[PDB]
Protein backbone atom coordinates (compact mmCIF):
# COMPACT_ATOMS: atom_id res chain seq x y z
CA UNK A 214 0.00 0.00 0.00
CA UNK A 215 1.13 3.61 -0.55
CA UNK A 216 1.98 5.71 2.47
CA UNK A 217 -0.73 8.10 3.56
CA UNK A 218 -0.45 11.86 4.03
CA UNK A 219 -3.47 12.72 6.17
CA UNK A 220 -3.19 16.50 5.68
CA UNK A 221 -4.45 15.85 2.13
CA UNK A 222 -7.80 14.81 3.53
CA UNK A 223 -7.97 17.23 6.47
CA UNK A 224 -7.34 20.17 4.11
CA UNK A 225 -9.90 18.93 1.60
CA UNK A 226 -13.44 20.31 1.85
CA UNK A 227 -14.67 16.69 2.16
CA UNK A 228 -12.28 15.47 4.87
CA UNK A 229 -11.97 18.75 6.77
CA UNK A 230 -14.52 17.75 9.43
CA UNK A 231 -13.73 14.05 9.56
CA UNK A 232 -12.76 14.15 13.26
CA UNK A 233 -15.45 16.61 14.37
CA UNK A 234 -16.92 15.10 17.49
CA UNK A 235 -14.05 12.74 18.29
CA UNK A 236 -13.18 12.75 21.99
CA UNK A 237 -9.64 13.71 22.93
CA UNK A 238 -7.32 11.74 25.23
CA UNK A 239 -3.84 12.03 26.68
CA UNK A 240 -1.36 9.28 27.54
CA UNK A 241 1.51 9.90 29.96
CA UNK A 242 4.98 8.67 29.06
CA UNK A 243 5.65 4.97 29.61
CA UNK A 244 1.93 4.20 29.93
CA UNK A 245 0.39 1.24 28.11
CA UNK A 246 -2.19 2.49 25.62
CA UNK A 247 -3.51 -1.04 25.17
CA UNK A 248 -2.49 -4.70 25.45
CA UNK A 249 -3.84 -8.21 24.89
CA UNK A 250 -6.74 -9.50 27.01
CA UNK A 251 -7.81 -5.94 26.32
CA UNK A 252 -11.38 -5.35 27.41
CA UNK A 253 -11.28 -2.03 25.53
CA UNK A 254 -11.77 -1.31 21.83
CA UNK A 255 -12.17 1.45 19.28
CA UNK A 256 -10.15 3.60 16.91
CA UNK A 257 -7.82 6.54 17.41
CA UNK A 258 -5.54 8.97 15.65
CA UNK A 259 -2.34 10.37 17.09
CA UNK A 260 -2.37 14.16 17.37
CA UNK A 261 1.19 14.57 18.60
CA UNK A 262 3.56 12.37 20.54
CA UNK A 263 4.78 8.87 19.80
CA UNK A 264 3.58 5.35 20.52
CA UNK A 265 5.36 2.05 20.06
CA UNK A 266 3.57 -1.01 18.73
CA UNK A 267 5.03 -4.38 19.59
CA UNK A 268 4.91 -7.99 20.74
CA UNK A 269 7.17 -9.74 23.24
CA UNK A 270 8.78 -13.15 23.56
CA UNK A 271 12.08 -15.04 23.86
CA UNK A 272 13.49 -12.72 26.55
CA UNK A 273 13.33 -10.12 23.77
CA UNK A 274 10.79 -7.46 22.79
CA UNK A 275 10.00 -7.11 19.09
CA UNK A 276 9.33 -3.48 18.20
CA UNK A 277 7.08 -3.54 15.15
CA UNK A 278 6.63 0.16 14.35
CA UNK A 279 5.73 3.53 15.81
CA UNK A 280 2.69 5.78 15.70
CA UNK A 281 3.16 9.53 15.35
CA UNK A 282 1.07 12.59 14.41
CA UNK A 283 -1.43 11.56 11.75
CA UNK A 284 -1.22 7.80 12.21
CA UNK A 285 -4.42 5.83 12.93
CA UNK A 286 -4.70 2.55 14.85
CA UNK A 287 -7.25 0.49 16.76
CA UNK A 288 -7.55 -1.01 20.25
CA UNK A 289 -8.00 -4.61 19.06
CA UNK A 290 -4.95 -5.54 16.98
CA UNK A 291 -3.63 -7.98 19.58
CA UNK A 292 -0.59 -5.72 19.61
CA UNK A 293 0.86 -3.82 22.54
CA UNK A 294 0.90 -0.02 22.39
CA UNK A 295 2.83 2.24 24.74
CA UNK A 296 3.54 5.93 24.80
CA UNK A 297 7.24 6.76 24.59
CA UNK A 298 6.07 10.32 25.12
CA UNK A 299 3.14 12.37 26.28
CA UNK A 300 0.89 11.83 23.28
CA UNK A 301 -2.59 13.13 22.48
CA UNK A 302 -5.05 11.14 20.37
CA UNK A 303 -8.56 11.70 19.06
CA UNK A 304 -10.75 8.69 19.88
CA UNK A 305 -14.00 7.10 18.76
CA UNK A 306 -15.72 3.70 18.71
CA UNK A 307 -15.52 1.44 15.66
CA UNK A 308 -19.01 2.26 14.43
CA UNK A 309 -18.52 6.01 14.52
CA UNK A 310 -15.26 5.58 12.63
CA UNK A 311 -16.79 3.28 10.04
CA UNK A 312 -19.59 5.77 9.49
CA UNK A 313 -17.12 8.61 9.05
CA UNK A 314 -15.07 6.49 6.62
CA UNK A 315 -18.04 5.69 4.43
CA UNK A 316 -18.96 9.38 4.41
CA UNK A 317 -15.36 10.27 3.52
CA UNK A 318 -13.77 7.29 1.68
CA UNK A 319 -10.49 9.16 1.07
CA UNK A 320 -9.65 8.90 4.76
CA UNK A 321 -9.72 5.09 4.27
CA UNK A 322 -6.20 5.22 2.90
CA UNK A 323 -4.93 6.07 6.37
CA UNK A 324 -6.22 2.68 7.50
CA UNK A 325 -4.87 0.99 4.39
CA UNK A 326 -1.44 2.52 4.94
CA UNK A 327 -1.15 1.60 8.62
CA UNK A 328 -2.25 -1.95 7.92
CA UNK A 329 0.57 -2.10 5.39
CA UNK A 330 3.07 -0.66 7.83
CA UNK A 331 1.96 -3.20 10.42
CA UNK A 332 2.14 -6.00 7.88
CA UNK A 333 5.67 -5.35 6.53
CA UNK A 334 6.89 -4.84 10.10
CA UNK A 335 5.68 -8.36 10.87
CA UNK A 336 7.18 -9.74 7.68
CA UNK A 337 10.45 -8.20 8.72
CA UNK A 338 10.18 -9.82 12.16
CA UNK A 339 9.33 -13.20 10.59
CA UNK A 340 12.24 -12.71 8.19
CA UNK A 341 14.54 -12.02 11.14
CA UNK A 342 13.62 -15.41 12.59
CA UNK A 343 13.77 -17.60 9.51
CA UNK A 344 17.30 -16.20 8.96
CA UNK A 345 18.65 -15.44 12.46
CA UNK A 346 21.72 -17.64 11.93
CA UNK A 347 22.66 -16.98 8.29
CA UNK A 348 22.63 -13.30 9.26
CA UNK A 349 25.03 -13.79 12.18
CA UNK A 350 27.15 -15.98 9.91
CA UNK A 351 27.25 -13.23 7.29
CA UNK A 352 27.96 -10.71 10.03
CA UNK A 353 30.86 -12.96 10.98
CA UNK A 354 32.05 -13.12 7.38
CA UNK A 355 32.02 -9.32 7.12
CA UNK A 356 33.95 -8.97 10.35
CA UNK A 357 36.61 -11.55 9.46
CA UNK A 358 37.05 -10.22 5.91
CA UNK A 359 37.00 -6.50 6.60
CA UNK A 360 39.94 -4.15 6.00
CA UNK A 361 40.30 -0.43 6.74
CA UNK A 362 41.71 2.64 4.97
CA UNK A 363 44.02 5.39 6.23
CA UNK A 364 42.40 7.58 8.89
CA UNK A 365 43.77 10.66 7.12
CA UNK A 366 40.76 11.84 5.13
CA UNK A 367 39.75 8.51 5.69
CA UNK A 368 38.98 5.51 7.93
CA UNK A 369 36.51 3.24 6.13
CA UNK A 370 35.91 -0.47 6.67
CA UNK A 371 35.39 -2.33 3.40
CA UNK A 372 34.28 -5.79 2.31
CA UNK A 373 34.50 -6.25 -1.44
CA UNK A 374 32.74 -9.45 -2.43
CA UNK A 375 29.76 -10.17 -4.64
CA UNK A 376 26.70 -11.86 -3.15
CA UNK A 377 27.62 -15.03 -5.04
CA UNK A 378 31.25 -14.92 -3.83
CA UNK A 379 29.83 -14.51 -0.33
CA UNK A 380 27.22 -17.27 -0.73
CA UNK A 381 29.91 -19.66 -2.01
CA UNK A 382 32.14 -18.93 0.96
CA UNK A 383 29.54 -19.23 3.74
CA UNK A 384 27.86 -22.16 2.02
CA UNK A 385 24.17 -21.20 2.11
CA UNK A 386 22.20 -20.63 -1.10
CA UNK A 387 22.71 -17.51 -3.17
CA UNK A 388 19.11 -16.34 -2.81
CA UNK A 389 19.08 -17.06 0.94
CA UNK A 390 22.27 -15.04 1.32
CA UNK A 391 20.78 -12.18 -0.68
CA UNK A 392 17.84 -11.98 1.76
CA UNK A 393 20.03 -12.31 4.84
CA UNK A 394 22.43 -9.67 3.54
CA UNK A 395 19.63 -7.44 2.26
CA UNK A 396 18.16 -7.87 5.72
CA UNK A 397 21.38 -6.67 7.38
CA UNK A 398 21.60 -3.77 4.95
CA UNK A 399 18.15 -2.59 6.08
CA UNK A 400 19.29 -2.52 9.71
CA UNK A 401 22.12 -0.27 8.55
CA UNK A 402 24.80 -2.72 9.68
CA UNK A 403 26.17 -2.99 6.17
CA UNK A 404 26.11 -0.35 3.44
CA UNK A 405 26.14 -1.20 -0.24
CA UNK A 406 28.11 1.07 -2.56
CA UNK A 407 27.75 -0.75 -5.87
CA UNK A 408 27.92 -4.45 -6.71
CA UNK A 409 30.87 -6.30 -5.21
CA UNK A 410 31.64 -3.34 -2.94
CA UNK A 411 30.28 -2.78 0.59
CA UNK A 412 31.10 -0.70 3.67
CA UNK A 413 30.68 -1.25 7.39
CA UNK A 414 29.46 1.85 9.28
CA UNK A 415 30.51 1.44 12.92
CA UNK A 416 32.13 -1.99 13.16
CA UNK A 417 31.10 -2.33 16.83
CA UNK A 418 27.41 -2.62 15.94
CA UNK A 419 28.06 -5.18 13.19
CA UNK A 420 30.13 -7.11 15.73
CA UNK A 421 27.02 -6.94 17.90
CA UNK A 422 25.00 -8.31 15.00
CA UNK A 423 26.99 -11.54 15.20
CA UNK B 424 -10.79 -4.61 9.81
CA UNK B 425 -14.24 -6.08 9.14
CA UNK B 426 -14.78 -9.02 6.81
CA UNK B 427 -15.51 -7.99 3.24
CA UNK B 428 -18.12 -9.38 0.85
CA UNK B 429 -17.16 -8.42 -2.71
CA UNK B 430 -20.55 -9.34 -4.18
CA UNK B 431 -21.90 -6.33 -2.27
CA UNK B 432 -19.88 -3.99 -4.41
CA UNK B 433 -20.00 -5.91 -7.70
CA UNK B 434 -23.81 -6.03 -7.68
CA UNK B 435 -24.10 -2.32 -7.01
CA UNK B 436 -24.44 0.05 -9.97
CA UNK B 437 -21.29 1.81 -8.77
CA UNK B 438 -19.13 -1.30 -8.48
CA UNK B 439 -20.63 -3.39 -11.26
CA UNK B 440 -17.89 -2.27 -13.68
CA UNK B 441 -15.00 -2.23 -11.22
CA UNK B 442 -13.05 -4.96 -13.01
CA UNK B 443 -14.30 -4.02 -16.50
CA UNK B 444 -10.95 -3.83 -18.30
CA UNK B 445 -8.78 -6.22 -16.31
CA UNK B 446 -7.14 -8.95 -18.34
CA UNK B 447 -7.58 -12.64 -17.53
CA UNK B 448 -4.97 -15.27 -16.73
CA UNK B 449 -5.16 -18.97 -15.97
CA UNK B 450 -2.54 -20.31 -13.57
CA UNK B 451 -1.83 -24.04 -13.84
CA UNK B 452 -1.70 -26.12 -10.67
CA UNK B 453 1.71 -26.01 -9.01
CA UNK B 454 2.31 -22.80 -11.00
CA UNK B 455 4.23 -20.02 -9.26
CA UNK B 456 2.18 -16.79 -9.52
CA UNK B 457 4.54 -14.67 -7.46
CA UNK B 458 8.27 -15.12 -7.04
CA UNK B 459 10.00 -13.61 -4.02
CA UNK B 460 11.79 -11.58 -6.69
CA UNK B 461 9.34 -11.14 -9.55
CA UNK B 462 10.13 -7.48 -10.27
CA UNK B 463 6.99 -6.83 -12.37
CA UNK B 464 3.99 -5.37 -10.58
CA UNK B 465 0.22 -5.31 -10.47
CA UNK B 466 -2.93 -6.28 -8.59
CA UNK B 467 -5.16 -9.28 -9.17
CA UNK B 468 -8.42 -10.71 -7.89
CA UNK B 469 -9.03 -14.44 -7.73
CA UNK B 470 -11.93 -15.52 -9.93
CA UNK B 471 -11.82 -19.19 -8.90
CA UNK B 472 -9.20 -21.62 -7.67
CA UNK B 473 -6.83 -21.32 -4.74
CA UNK B 474 -3.42 -19.73 -4.19
CA UNK B 475 -0.89 -20.20 -1.42
CA UNK B 476 1.03 -17.30 0.10
CA UNK B 477 4.23 -18.36 1.78
CA UNK B 478 7.75 -17.31 2.60
CA UNK B 479 10.92 -19.35 2.07
CA UNK B 480 13.64 -19.42 4.71
CA UNK B 481 16.73 -21.48 5.48
CA UNK B 482 15.67 -24.47 3.40
CA UNK B 483 12.05 -24.67 4.59
CA UNK B 484 8.72 -23.02 3.76
CA UNK B 485 5.98 -21.53 5.92
CA UNK B 486 2.38 -21.12 4.73
CA UNK B 487 0.71 -17.82 5.70
CA UNK B 488 -2.79 -17.90 4.20
CA UNK B 489 -4.64 -18.73 0.99
CA UNK B 490 -6.51 -16.72 -1.60
CA UNK B 491 -9.81 -17.92 -3.01
CA UNK B 492 -12.57 -16.45 -5.17
CA UNK B 493 -13.12 -12.74 -4.48
CA UNK B 494 -9.75 -12.14 -2.83
CA UNK B 495 -7.54 -9.34 -4.15
CA UNK B 496 -3.77 -9.30 -3.83
CA UNK B 497 -0.68 -7.70 -5.32
CA UNK B 498 2.56 -8.66 -7.04
CA UNK B 499 4.86 -6.87 -4.58
CA UNK B 500 4.12 -8.31 -1.16
CA UNK B 501 7.49 -10.03 -1.22
CA UNK B 502 5.71 -13.27 -0.39
CA UNK B 503 5.66 -16.14 -2.89
CA UNK B 504 2.31 -17.09 -4.40
CA UNK B 505 1.69 -20.53 -5.91
CA UNK B 506 -1.57 -21.97 -7.24
CA UNK B 507 -2.81 -25.12 -5.47
CA UNK B 508 -5.17 -25.90 -8.38
CA UNK B 509 -6.25 -24.45 -11.74
CA UNK B 510 -6.91 -20.85 -10.80
CA UNK B 511 -8.18 -17.93 -12.83
CA UNK B 512 -7.26 -14.36 -11.85
CA UNK B 513 -8.17 -10.97 -13.27
CA UNK B 514 -5.10 -8.72 -13.21
CA UNK B 515 -4.11 -5.14 -14.01
CA UNK B 516 -1.38 -2.67 -13.07
CA UNK B 517 -1.36 -0.66 -9.85
CA UNK B 518 -2.21 2.52 -11.73
CA UNK B 519 -5.42 1.02 -13.14
CA UNK B 520 -6.45 -0.49 -9.81
CA UNK B 521 -5.94 2.77 -7.90
CA UNK B 522 -7.93 4.65 -10.53
CA UNK B 523 -10.83 2.20 -10.16
CA UNK B 524 -10.62 2.45 -6.35
CA UNK B 525 -10.81 6.22 -6.75
CA UNK B 526 -14.14 6.05 -8.58
CA UNK B 527 -15.41 3.12 -6.49
CA UNK B 528 -14.21 3.70 -2.88
CA UNK B 529 -16.42 0.93 -1.52
CA UNK B 530 -14.18 -1.66 -3.15
CA UNK B 531 -11.30 -0.39 -0.98
CA UNK B 532 -12.68 -2.44 1.89
CA UNK B 533 -11.60 -5.53 -0.02
CA UNK B 534 -8.01 -4.24 0.03
CA UNK B 535 -8.37 -3.37 3.72
CA UNK B 536 -9.66 -6.88 4.43
CA UNK B 537 -6.88 -8.76 2.69
CA UNK B 538 -4.29 -6.64 4.50
CA UNK B 539 -5.91 -7.45 7.84
CA UNK B 540 -5.99 -11.15 7.00
CA UNK B 541 -2.31 -11.08 6.03
CA UNK B 542 -1.48 -9.09 9.16
CA UNK B 543 -3.36 -11.61 11.27
CA UNK B 544 -1.70 -14.54 9.55
CA UNK B 545 1.75 -13.07 10.19
CA UNK B 546 1.09 -12.45 13.86
CA UNK B 547 0.01 -16.06 14.20
CA UNK B 548 3.15 -17.17 12.34
CA UNK B 549 5.34 -15.18 14.69
CA UNK B 550 3.63 -16.77 17.70
CA UNK B 551 4.29 -20.19 16.21
CA UNK B 552 7.98 -19.54 15.57
CA UNK B 553 8.69 -18.37 19.10
CA UNK B 554 6.70 -21.19 20.70
CA UNK B 555 8.64 -23.63 18.54
CA UNK B 556 11.95 -22.11 19.70
CA UNK B 557 11.21 -22.07 23.43
CA UNK B 558 10.32 -25.76 23.17
CA UNK B 559 13.75 -26.62 21.77
CA UNK B 560 15.23 -24.57 24.59
CA UNK B 561 13.36 -26.66 27.14
CA UNK B 562 14.26 -29.68 25.02
CA UNK B 563 17.98 -28.98 25.09
CA UNK B 564 17.65 -28.01 28.75
CA UNK B 565 16.45 -31.50 29.70
CA UNK B 566 19.39 -32.91 27.71
CA UNK B 567 22.13 -31.04 29.58
CA UNK B 568 20.48 -31.77 32.93
CA UNK B 569 19.74 -35.50 32.73
CA UNK B 570 20.16 -37.77 35.76
CA UNK B 571 20.64 -41.19 34.15
CA UNK B 572 20.34 -43.73 36.99
CA UNK B 573 18.32 -46.76 38.07
CA UNK B 574 17.77 -47.27 33.70
CA UNK B 575 15.53 -44.36 34.71
CA UNK B 576 17.00 -41.14 33.26
CA UNK B 577 15.40 -38.00 34.69
CA UNK B 578 15.45 -34.25 35.43
CA UNK B 579 14.83 -32.76 38.88
CA UNK B 580 13.73 -29.14 38.37
CA UNK B 581 10.49 -27.26 39.06
CA UNK B 582 8.86 -25.24 36.26
CA UNK B 583 10.16 -22.01 37.77
CA UNK B 584 13.74 -23.31 37.78
CA UNK B 585 13.69 -24.51 34.19
CA UNK B 586 12.08 -21.20 33.22
CA UNK B 587 14.64 -19.03 35.00
CA UNK B 588 17.56 -21.06 33.65
CA UNK B 589 15.92 -21.09 30.21
CA UNK B 590 15.65 -17.32 30.37
CA UNK B 591 11.87 -17.25 30.08
CA UNK B 592 8.71 -16.89 32.19
CA UNK B 593 7.17 -19.52 34.46
CA UNK B 594 4.01 -19.22 32.38
CA UNK B 595 5.70 -19.29 28.98
CA UNK B 596 7.85 -22.36 29.61
CA UNK B 597 4.97 -24.07 31.40
CA UNK B 598 2.76 -24.10 28.29
CA UNK B 599 5.65 -25.04 26.00
CA UNK B 600 6.62 -27.78 28.44
CA UNK B 601 3.15 -29.26 28.85
CA UNK B 602 3.13 -29.24 25.07
CA UNK B 603 6.34 -31.30 25.01
CA UNK B 604 4.54 -33.59 27.48
CA UNK B 605 1.29 -34.21 25.56
CA UNK B 606 3.48 -35.19 22.63
CA UNK B 607 5.31 -37.76 24.76
CA UNK B 608 8.92 -36.55 24.98
CA UNK B 609 8.93 -35.77 28.71
CA UNK B 610 6.76 -37.02 31.58
CA UNK B 611 5.79 -35.04 34.68
CA UNK B 612 5.73 -37.48 37.59
CA UNK B 613 5.44 -34.94 40.40
CA UNK B 614 6.58 -31.36 40.99
CA UNK B 615 10.27 -31.03 40.18
CA UNK B 616 10.47 -34.57 38.86
CA UNK B 617 10.37 -35.49 35.18
CA UNK B 618 11.58 -38.55 33.24
CA UNK B 619 12.92 -38.53 29.68
CA UNK B 620 11.49 -41.54 27.81
CA UNK B 621 13.63 -41.92 24.68
CA UNK B 622 16.56 -39.51 24.82
CA UNK B 623 17.31 -39.51 21.09
CA UNK B 624 13.85 -38.10 20.38
CA UNK B 625 14.42 -35.26 22.83
CA UNK B 626 17.97 -34.70 21.56
CA UNK B 627 16.33 -34.51 18.14
CA UNK B 628 14.06 -31.61 19.03
CA UNK B 629 16.90 -29.52 20.47
Ligand code: HEM
Nearest residue numbers: 214215216332333466495496497499500501517521534538
Ligand atom coordinates in the same frame (compact mmCIF):
# COMPACT_ATOMS: atom_id res chain seq x y z
C1 HEM C 1 -3.73 -5.69 -3.00
C2 HEM C 1 -2.91 -5.97 -1.81
C3 HEM C 1 -1.70 -5.37 -1.50
C4 HEM C 1 -0.85 -5.90 -0.60
C5 HEM C 1 -1.14 -7.03 0.36
C6 HEM C 1 0.31 -5.06 -0.56
C7 HEM C 1 1.45 -5.37 0.14
C8 HEM C 1 2.56 -4.56 0.22
C9 HEM C 1 3.66 -4.86 1.09
C10 HEM C 1 3.80 -6.13 1.92
C11 HEM C 1 4.51 -3.81 0.99
C12 HEM C 1 5.89 -3.76 1.60
C13 HEM C 1 6.99 -4.12 0.60
C14 HEM C 1 8.20 -4.77 1.25
O1 HEM C 1 8.07 -5.90 1.79
O2 HEM C 1 9.29 -4.15 1.23
C15 HEM C 1 3.93 -2.85 0.08
C16 HEM C 1 4.58 -1.72 -0.38
C17 HEM C 1 4.08 -0.86 -1.34
N1 HEM C 1 2.82 -0.99 -1.91
FE1 HEM C 1 1.48 -2.44 -1.62
N2 HEM C 1 0.17 -3.93 -1.34
C18 HEM C 1 -1.10 -4.08 -1.93
C19 HEM C 1 -1.68 -3.09 -2.74
C20 HEM C 1 -1.05 -1.89 -3.13
C21 HEM C 1 -1.72 -0.81 -3.89
C22 HEM C 1 -3.18 -0.74 -4.33
C23 HEM C 1 -0.80 0.19 -4.05
C24 HEM C 1 -0.93 1.47 -4.62
C25 HEM C 1 -2.17 2.25 -4.81
C26 HEM C 1 0.40 -0.29 -3.41
C27 HEM C 1 1.55 0.47 -3.38
C28 HEM C 1 2.68 0.13 -2.69
C29 HEM C 1 3.81 1.02 -2.60
C30 HEM C 1 3.82 2.46 -3.13
C31 HEM C 1 4.72 0.38 -1.80
C32 HEM C 1 6.12 0.85 -1.48
C33 HEM C 1 6.25 2.22 -0.81
C34 HEM C 1 5.77 2.22 0.64
O3 HEM C 1 4.55 2.06 0.88
O4 HEM C 1 6.62 2.38 1.54
N3 HEM C 1 0.24 -1.52 -2.81
N4 HEM C 1 2.71 -3.32 -0.39
Ligand code: HEM
Nearest residue numbers: 256285286287289290291307310311424425426539542543
Ligand atom coordinates in the same frame (compact mmCIF):
# COMPACT_ATOMS: atom_id res chain seq x y z
C1 HEM D 1 -7.01 1.22 12.72
C2 HEM D 1 -6.43 -0.05 12.19
C3 HEM D 1 -6.87 -1.32 12.51
C4 HEM D 1 -6.04 -2.35 12.79
C5 HEM D 1 -4.54 -2.24 13.05
C6 HEM D 1 -6.86 -3.54 12.86
C7 HEM D 1 -6.36 -4.79 13.15
C8 HEM D 1 -7.16 -5.93 13.37
C9 HEM D 1 -6.62 -7.26 13.66
C10 HEM D 1 -5.15 -7.68 13.76
C11 HEM D 1 -7.70 -8.09 13.77
C12 HEM D 1 -7.61 -9.55 14.11
C13 HEM D 1 -7.61 -9.71 15.62
C14 HEM D 1 -7.38 -11.15 16.04
O1 HEM D 1 -8.17 -12.03 15.60
O2 HEM D 1 -6.43 -11.40 16.81
C15 HEM D 1 -8.90 -7.30 13.53
C16 HEM D 1 -10.21 -7.81 13.57
C17 HEM D 1 -11.37 -7.04 13.38
N1 HEM D 1 -11.38 -5.69 13.09
FE1 HEM D 1 -9.80 -4.48 12.89
N2 HEM D 1 -8.22 -3.23 12.70
C18 HEM D 1 -8.23 -1.85 12.50
C19 HEM D 1 -9.39 -1.09 12.39
C20 HEM D 1 -10.67 -1.61 12.41
C21 HEM D 1 -11.80 -0.83 12.02
C22 HEM D 1 -11.84 0.66 11.65
C23 HEM D 1 -12.87 -1.68 12.06
C24 HEM D 1 -14.16 -1.38 11.63
C25 HEM D 1 -14.45 -0.92 10.28
C26 HEM D 1 -12.38 -2.98 12.49
C27 HEM D 1 -13.20 -4.11 12.63
C28 HEM D 1 -12.72 -5.37 12.97
C29 HEM D 1 -13.54 -6.53 13.21
C30 HEM D 1 -15.05 -6.58 13.17
C31 HEM D 1 -12.72 -7.58 13.42
C32 HEM D 1 -13.06 -9.05 13.30
C33 HEM D 1 -12.85 -9.33 11.81
C34 HEM D 1 -12.14 -10.64 11.54
O3 HEM D 1 -12.08 -11.50 12.45
O4 HEM D 1 -11.64 -10.81 10.40
N3 HEM D 1 -11.01 -2.94 12.66
N4 HEM D 1 -8.57 -5.96 13.29
